[PDB]
Amino acid sequence: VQSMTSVVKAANFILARPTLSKIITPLAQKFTAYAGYREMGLKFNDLLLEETPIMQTAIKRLPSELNYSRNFRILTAHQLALSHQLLPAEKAVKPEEDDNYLIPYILEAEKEAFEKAELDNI
Amino acid sequence: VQSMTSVVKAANFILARPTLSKIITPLAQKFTAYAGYREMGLKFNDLLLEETPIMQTAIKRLPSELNYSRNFRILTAHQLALSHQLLPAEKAVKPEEDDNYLIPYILEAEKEAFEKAELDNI
Amino acid sequence: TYMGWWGSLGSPKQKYITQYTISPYAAKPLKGAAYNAVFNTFRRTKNQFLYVAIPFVVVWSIWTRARDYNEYLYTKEGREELERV
Amino acid sequence: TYMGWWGSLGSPKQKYITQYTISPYAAKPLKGAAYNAVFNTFRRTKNQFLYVAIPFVVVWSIWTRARDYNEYLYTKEGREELERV
Amino acid sequence: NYQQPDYSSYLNNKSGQGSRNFTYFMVGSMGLLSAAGAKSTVEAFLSSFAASADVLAMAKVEVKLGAIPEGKNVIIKWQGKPVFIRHRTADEIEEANQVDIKTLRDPQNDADRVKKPEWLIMLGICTHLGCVPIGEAGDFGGWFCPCHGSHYDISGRIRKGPAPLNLEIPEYDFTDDETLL
Amino acid sequence: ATIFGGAFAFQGFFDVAVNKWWEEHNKAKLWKNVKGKFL
Amino acid sequence: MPTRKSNTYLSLVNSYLIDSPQPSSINYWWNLGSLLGLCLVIQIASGVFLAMHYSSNIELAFDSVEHIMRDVNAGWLIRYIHANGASFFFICMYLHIGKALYYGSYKQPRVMLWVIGVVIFILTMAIAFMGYCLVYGQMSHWGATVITNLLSAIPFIGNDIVPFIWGGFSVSNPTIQRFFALHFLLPFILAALVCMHLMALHVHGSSNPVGITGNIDRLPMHPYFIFKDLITVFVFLLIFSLFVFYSPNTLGHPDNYIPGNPMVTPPSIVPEWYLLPFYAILRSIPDKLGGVIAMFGAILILLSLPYTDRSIIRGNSFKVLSKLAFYLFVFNFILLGNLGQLHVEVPYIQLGQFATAYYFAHYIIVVPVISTLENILYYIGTQ
Amino acid sequence: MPTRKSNTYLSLVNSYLIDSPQPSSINYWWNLGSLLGLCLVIQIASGVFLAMHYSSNIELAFDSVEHIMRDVNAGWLIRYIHANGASFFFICMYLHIGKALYYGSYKQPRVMLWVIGVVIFILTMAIAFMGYCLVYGQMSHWGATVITNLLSAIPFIGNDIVPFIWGGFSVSNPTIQRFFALHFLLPFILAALVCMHLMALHVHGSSNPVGITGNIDRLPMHPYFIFKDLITVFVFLLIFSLFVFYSPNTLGHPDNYIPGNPMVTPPSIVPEWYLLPFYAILRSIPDKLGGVIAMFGAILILLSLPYTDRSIIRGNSFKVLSKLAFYLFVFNFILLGNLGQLHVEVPYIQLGQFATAYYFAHYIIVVPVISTLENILYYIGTQ
Numbered sequence A, B: 001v002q003s004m005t006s007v008v009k010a011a012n013f014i015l016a017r018p019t020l021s022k023i024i025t026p027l028a029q030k031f032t033a034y035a036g037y038r039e040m041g042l043k044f045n046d047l048l049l050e051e052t053p054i055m056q057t058a059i060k061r062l063p064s065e066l067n068y069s070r071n072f073r074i075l076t077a078h079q080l081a082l083s084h085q086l087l088p089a090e091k092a093v094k095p096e097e098d099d100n101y102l103i104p105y106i107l108e109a110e111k112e113a114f115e116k117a118e119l120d121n122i
Numbered sequence C, D: 001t002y003m004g005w006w007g008s009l010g011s012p013k014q015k016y017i018t019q020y021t022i023s024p025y026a027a028k029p030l031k032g033a034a035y036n037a038v039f040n041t042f043r044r045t046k047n048q049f050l051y052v053a054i055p056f057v058v059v060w061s062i063w064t065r066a067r068d069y070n071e072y073l074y075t076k077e078g079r080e081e082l083e084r085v
Numbered sequence E: 001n002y003q004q005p006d007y008s009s010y011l012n013n014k015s016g017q018g019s020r021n022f023t024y025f026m027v028g029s030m031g032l033l034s035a036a037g038a039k040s041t042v043e044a045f046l047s048s049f050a051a052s053a054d055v056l057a058m059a060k061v062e063v064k065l066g067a068i069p070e071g072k073n074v075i076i077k078w079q080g081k082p083v084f085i086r087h088r089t090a091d092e093i094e095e096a097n098q099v100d101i102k103t104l105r106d107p108q109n110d111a112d113r114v115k116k117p118e119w120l121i122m123l124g125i126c127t128h129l130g131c132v133p134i135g136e137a138g139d140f141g142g143w144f145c146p147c148h149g150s151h152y153d154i155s156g157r158i159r160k161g162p163a164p165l166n167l168e169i170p171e172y173d174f175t176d177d178e179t180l181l
Numbered sequence F: 001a002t003i004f005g006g007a008f009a010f011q012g013f014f015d016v017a018v019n020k021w022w023e024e025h026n027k028a029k030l031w032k033n034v035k036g037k038f039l
Numbered sequence G, H: 001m002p003t004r005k006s007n008t009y010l011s012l013v014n015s016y017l018i019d020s021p022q023p024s025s026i027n028y029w030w031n032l033g034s035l036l037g038l039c040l041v042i043q044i045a046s047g048v049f050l051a052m053h054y055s056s057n058i059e060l061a062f063d064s065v066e067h068i069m070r071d072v073n074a075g076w077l078i079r080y081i082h083a084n085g086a087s088f089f090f091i092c093m094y095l096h097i098g099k100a101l102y103y104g105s106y107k108q109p110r111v112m113l114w115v116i117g118v119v120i121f122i123l124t125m126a127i128a129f130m131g132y133c134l135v136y137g138q139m140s141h142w143g144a145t146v147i148t149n150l151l152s153a154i155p156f157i158g159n160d161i162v163p164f165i166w167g168g169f170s171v172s173n174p175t176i177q178r179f180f181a182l183h184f185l186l187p188f189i190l191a192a193l194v195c196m197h198l199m200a201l202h203v204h205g206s207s208n209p210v211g212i213t214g215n216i217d218r219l220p221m222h223p224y225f226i227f228k229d230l231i232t233v234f235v236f237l238l239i240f241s242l243f244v245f246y247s248p249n250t251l252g253h254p255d256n257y258i259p260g261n262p263m264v265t266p267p268s269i270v271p272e273w274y275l276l277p278f279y280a281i282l283r284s285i286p287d288k289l290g291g292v293i294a295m296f297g298a299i300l301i302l303l304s305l306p307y308t309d310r311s312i313i314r315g316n317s318f319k320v321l322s323k324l325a326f327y328l329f330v331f332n333f334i335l336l337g338n339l340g341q342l343h344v345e346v347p348y349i350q351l352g353q354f355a356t357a358y359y360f361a362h363y364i365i366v367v368p369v370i371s372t373l374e375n376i377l378y379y380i381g382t383q
């Protein structure tokens, strides 16, 4: 698995340089729209692989409102997959609501883990 | 398994009659002496089959001092059987100390169970 | 582990979500089986077609080229090229 | 159940009991194995002998009488008694 | 509490106890169809245990009959078990002439135990713990079961021993110098 | 139970239905119907 | 947690082998269980190496066994292992039943375990018998024939079940082939039953020679009862080697080395020794149906035992009369086994009838009567 | 507590069948496992009924199979089952691997499970191949011969291991007998491996088509996904009947009905269809040692897959590029299977080399590269 630290490292490596930014970012939005997760009510961070101690810590340190909203969105996605139907365009998650809410907590978890690893090998 | 209530019923049926008492009771003492459990520190009521709800309740309702004494006697018996040795005659449980300490609680548990069964079929 | 039993499945603290449902014996079974199995199945196939068609088109084009070349090789006109290989 | 794992094996509240022991490396192995395996083994056999001897004596007496009678039947002097049976 | 979602369209039109009755009907129909299919499959598989066509063809095999010394007991191999074909002389027939309504676990006579005295057919397998009897050790003059010492009469009747019945007579028919099973 | 007995009902029903439809669809081909011509 | 607990498979191995809380007072008899498992491996292991050379066809079975004996490199060793190891499997299983009968291992908390035990026993007997039928010696063939003929005594289905058992009209090629298939298989069903036995043991743990609860003083299994199991295993293998390498045919019957001939019965029909007792019971009852019913009861009555044993105290170790009764029963069982191999003769028919009578009387009279009498004697003695 | 939880045996059956908290969003693909288990039963069931009639001798193997087909009552049914059911066993296993590859069922919490999966796969192939060798047709014999000749390429032990496999100097009676024994056996080892598979599944549960955690909405299994299992099972049995009863030899090869003759090699040697892909890989590499290593890598690289998959999101259902890569891989695998049966000819040698190259490149390049690219694309798009 790739760490959010490394994913964000690469993403900021690309975003800083105008040529790669202009080429990719339109392709990034196009890929995220064709991904089809937004049509099921899921934000991107709902898709993240929860089954890891870092990620488990990240969810365990979410605020109350974000935690409950995530629970409801995951349940809605499960129900939609269960009934083989999608949210109408008006009810789907819009690009501006895919706000990367969980990334900061995962980054903090990885920062803690990386400092612990570095200091254990001081 | 024979309910302790039935065992006491039979025992008093025998004891009440002087002829049967005079015949059995000497054989009763001789049988409990030859049984060999007393030389291992066990009183009679230590041998009782613990793995029954009635018996388990009876143990659960023992006084603290009797409970700890029973625990130590059982532990001593286990150690003796483990090391293949017996207590010296002076340390073995004398006939007077084989005092039937647990029977009252067992009989109370049996009485409660029998009352519950009788009323459930009223 | 990441999945306990029913009492504690590892789901985060869930709250404010109300789940309504109706019993069977009181719902129309196969409510929209006929219409859905056509329209929704077509919709799903439309969404997922390209992912199966582009790889299939590529692989089957390669296979067709190889098969046609092999058939051509073993003919009275493919004898020379077969010898050269 | 009637036996849990190590934390709670189902034993009653146990208290006031102290257990002492010494390391195996600090203890003499097979101390009185020579003397024990003779004297204590003889003691155990003495205690348990009658329970194995009386049943064995009864069964082997029955077997011996049966075997001897069978041997007697299949002989020139047992011919008549065999015929009667 | 609050306003429930409207299920009007999802609600069934059928009676309260009727729809569950129909559900029972189809669930039981599924169960019993599955039981019938399982019965068919299990019967088909177990039918393999039964005698294969080869074994059935091999059985009911005629035996090469013909002239043989009177009183001599021939042996055959019909259906695995030995067949003790004996051409008992007229002396054996005369001995069997003595009727026996008692002292015989199954009173019978050559009237049914053999079609003709010149050709006697009888399976050699004993009754209790089926074994091949000795053809001349019988206490009654016929076959003897060495395993238990049982004695088989010249007519095949069980005279003594642990015999549960009499010497079974195969279903072999007779013909002109041939055995027709 | 009644499962054992009921299975017979369905097994026999399907078995007889098929063993009555088959010898009607194929009556012109089976042995028992053709043997007359060669006898 | 340690790797031996976090991992699922290592967690199971830990629960059953490393940390299983055994009582500290268990004798060497409790090692027999392990031996049986080891034997179950041997029977399988060596067994799998005989199917690699055994040809199940009737006209090749005995010759194939002889090919194993004389031609395969270690074939003689594998065959002797597989045979004497079945004999030792049954020795250890009889000891494991005798222990469970002496100590009240069959009583309230462990009845299910006991039940599985009985089933295992039943199943094993079949397996063993079926395996014997594979050698197709004289004794092999005629034992198969006698078993099938007796099973033909079922009231109505008997006449129809036996041809299914034979696959023909007598013990022949289909019978031996199907016996080989079922004999290769049923050992794995027995492994499954053994796993069920182990789960039913683990739910409540094992008993004690003293009978009282062991929860007060239990010990782990890895330091203790693993190196006790090693002692028992090496004693087992030492005696097993005394048999396999020296006098390997002592337990077997010589007639089994005569290729099976349906037309000539051997002088006497006897199973392998471990089935003799039941065989004796079978011949004690005259009626064939009665004989089979009594034979199967001779095993199934172990199921009745946990309920007929009315003793408040588990086990025999502290009971005088019950110990005499148990040893009398054991010696009568050995007497039945001995009568199994003896001919039906004047004294022995009556002796076998009496032996079977007392064998069943043990379970249905002596155990209940003696247990109740001893309960009363205990209570009167202490007062 | 309910009897389905108090009793340990019923407790296990409940934990796995009646109350297993399956996620509510699983497709019909998750039913394949049950089918595989069902097939494992069928393979065993019919299998146990074929060994009751199959004679493993080389001079009797093919005649014994024909005796099953022609003489045994339902023998034709049992053989056609045991064969087409193996073909369907591998159809369902390939579908179960395809599902686990599409959805990230091999990712972190279930890596252990995945490993047993692979082992099962490997083991199964052996079993199937070995069983096929039992028919001892032309293709059976020559497949055994080719396999052993290829295994003869091990650097030093190769010259010595092959006689241990052959049990002689060429595929002969000992080879067929040992194949029969190990083929009867290894299915039970596979049953044990399937039990381990189910344990590793139960520890962490099953995944979802959406990939996200199912803990938020999990359903029991008795009223849900047992009746879905019945749909999948009955569809499986309906297609299995369309094959077994109608055109049962479609999946097999006609040359397998010609009794094995070492002195005449058939025009072409192909495994049974489900092993064709790997066979193709074996021929794509010229070196014999290279070929066998490359093939076993083609099977084992599934183990590397969970670590080369650098995807933060489980599964392909929400990934554009990875879905294209997966379907391209699946179609290349079918292309390899197709090339397996085709003669080594001018275009096909190069096409097979390229197909093998891309097959391995999938795992070691495309999955990591595509997963990393899609992680970056996801993060950039949301921002």
Ligand code: HEM
Pocket: G029, G030, G031, G032, G033, G034, G036, G037, G038, G040, G093, G096, G097, G100, G103, G104, G105, G106, G110, G113, G114, G116, G117, G118, G119, G120, G121, G194, G197, G198, G201, G205, G206, G207, G208, G302
């Ligand atoms: C392959 C055959 C068998 C195996 C591998 C097996 C396994 C075991 C094991 C591992 C133990 C624990 C160790 C011990 O208590 O000695 C045990 C105990 C036991 N065995 Fe078995 N068993 C087998 C057959 C049988 C049979 C046939 C019976 C009775 C008919 C039986 C009755 C018991 C009982 C009741 C216990 C519990 C002992 C106690 O708790 O006091 N077993 N068994």
Ligand code: HEM
Pocket: G040, G043, G044, G045, G046, G047, G048, G049, G050, G051, G054, G065, G079, G082, G083, G086, G087, G089, G124, G127, G128, G130, G131, G132, G134, G135, G183, G184, G187, G188, G190, G252
């Ligand atoms: C607890 C399980 C088993 C028991 C108690 C057992 C016992 C026996 C016994 C007593 C025999 C008679 C052999 C003789 O007297 O020469 C036998 C034969 C045989 N058994 Fe086993 N067996 C078991 C499992 C297996 C297994 C798993 C196999 C796998 C192949 C197997 C293969 C055979 C074979 C091939 C024979 C033929 C005997 C021969 O050729 O010498 N058995 N078995």
Ligand code: HEM
Pocket: H040, H043, H044, H045, H046, H047, H048, H049, H050, H051, H054, H064, H065, H079, H082, H083, H086, H087, H089, H124, H127, H128, H131, H132, H133, H134, H135, H183, H184, H187, H188, H190
């Ligand atoms: C997953 C497990 C198994 C698989 C995938 C499998 C598959 C196969 C296949 C494909 C064949 C080729 C048969 C043919 O082409 O005619 C075969 C043959 C055979 N298998 Fe299985 N099998 C399995 C387990 C078993 C088991 C447990 C047995 C137990 C007896 C067994 C017995 C046989 C026999 C006797 C044959 C010989 C084929 C014949 O005589 O027609 N198999 N197996």
Ligand code: HEM
Pocket: H029, H030, H031, H032, H033, H034, H036, H037, H038, H040, H093, H096, H097, H100, H103, H104, H105, H106, H110, H113, H114, H116, H117, H118, H119, H120, H121, H194, H197, H198, H201, H205, H206, H207, H208, H302
């Ligand atoms: C007899 C063969 C097999 C049986 C009976 C079996 C059993 C099962 C069962 C019951 C499930 C749950 C239902 C499902 O997820 O479809 C499952 C899932 C799975 N199967 Fe198997 N399995 C077998 C072989 C394999 C093989 C060979 C592989 C891979 C090489 C594999 C990989 C998996 C994985 C990874 C899962 C977990 C799926 C998930 O959680 O999304 N299985 N298996």
Ligand code: FES
Pocket: E126, E127, E128, E129, E130, E131, E145, E146, E147, E148, E149, E150, E162, E163
């Ligand atoms: S010989 Fe056993 S009863 Fe006839």
